[PDB]
Amino acid sequence: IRAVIYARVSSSDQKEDLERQINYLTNYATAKGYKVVEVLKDIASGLNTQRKGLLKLFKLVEGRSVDVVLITYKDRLTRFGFEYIEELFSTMGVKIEVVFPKDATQELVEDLISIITSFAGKIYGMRSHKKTVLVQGVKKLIGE
Amino acid sequence: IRAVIYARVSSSDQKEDLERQINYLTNYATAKGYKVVEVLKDIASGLNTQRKGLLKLFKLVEGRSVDVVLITYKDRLTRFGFEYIEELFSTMGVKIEVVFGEEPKDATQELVEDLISIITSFAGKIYGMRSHKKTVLVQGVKKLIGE
């Protein structure tokens, strides 16, 4: 069962934790009996739909080369719209195997802000005073 | 040539604005000369990936019946992950035609409603789906929005 490993970390500092993720899935697959075709990684947010590695994964899947995609948690593949990726892959007959995070809270808070900042711009103005009010307030509120 | 109309409104009260949507696109199409194969609608949030209409649209496109999808704004198809839907459709050789751009004007009420749900879900993920600190952040953000 030809497999493609997708691993992702948000920050550059977390570079060591990404290699551990690849390694978990690499040994996971070779114990399961999967031949690891390729290993695709990214040091970016789950929110970015234009990740270089993710778009290489899309092309790999579409090329009907691989049979299964391995990720540690759903969170790794994408923050939002997993179901759409699941649908794109399934039409190519590719299954997503989710091996399991209670760990990441800093990733959830950081992703929350970036959403609030973009939406605040859409609601009040990308260079408005009220946008700054909400984002400075929310940042202070999480501190508590 | 063969076209499918996708229209969406978040609330039941906005039922009049959904029919206006369908109409803009139905005529747009007859002017484009496109034959409108089907019209799919939904009274739900862009955040819901499991909309009955969206999933009927997915099956229609996958069946290679339709050639183009018409929407007024990207926003209508989905709040997040438009690029994934765009990719799913393109592999079936279906194009998404977005009639409008940076035109949203009333959209501020849908953006704030979606923003509250996002903060509520994330608060659960950060503090606990039934936690005290989750209630603290969501009650605070709601109060901060008023101002």
Numbering used by the authors:
A (entry chain B): 65 to 164, 168 to 211
B (entry chain A): 65 to 211
What are the paper's exact sentences on this?
TnpA binds specifically to the transposon ends and is a member of the SR family of DNA exchange enzymes, which are most often associated with site-specific recombination reactions. The SRs found in IS607-family transposable elements, however, are distinguished by the location of their DBDs at their N-termini (experimentally confirmed below). Although there is considerable structural similarity between the catalytic core domains of the subunits, the quaternary structures of the TnpA and smSRs dimers are radically different.
Although the overall configurations of the TnpAIS1535 and TnpAISC1926 dimers are similar, there are significant differences in the details of the dimer interfaces within the core. The TnpAISC1926 subunits are shifted apart by about 3 Å relative to TnpAIS1535, the TnpAISC1926 D helices are angled by about 15° rather than being parallel, and the TnpAISC1926 B helices are one turn longer than in TnpAIS1535. The active site serines of each TnpA dimer (TnpAIS1535 residue 59 and TnpAISC1926 residue 74) are separated by 28.6 and 31.5 Å (Cα atoms), respectively. The E helices are interrupted by a four residue β-turn (GRRG in TnpAIS1535 and GMRS in TnpAISC1926) and fold into an antiparallel structure. Proteolysis experiments and structure modeling suggests that winged-helix DNA binding domains are linked to the N-terminal end of the catalytic domain by peptide chains ranging in length from just three residues to about 10 residues (IS1535). Structural models of DNA-bound TnpAISC1926 dimers, where there is predicted to be less conformational freedom between the DBD and catalytic domains, are shown in Figure 8. Thus, the two DBDs can readily fit into adjacent major groove segments on the same helical face even with the short three residue linker that is present in TnpAISC1926. The best diffracting crystals of TnpAISC1926 CTD were obtained using the hanging drop method by mixing equal volumes of a 10 mg/ml protein solution in 20 mM MOPS, pH 7.0, 100 mM Na-acetate, 0.1 mM DTT with a reservoir solution containing 8% (v/v) tacsimate, pH 4.0, and 20% (w/v) PEG3350. Crystals grew at 25°C, and although additional cryoprotectants were screened, they show no increase in diffraction relative to the drop solution alone.
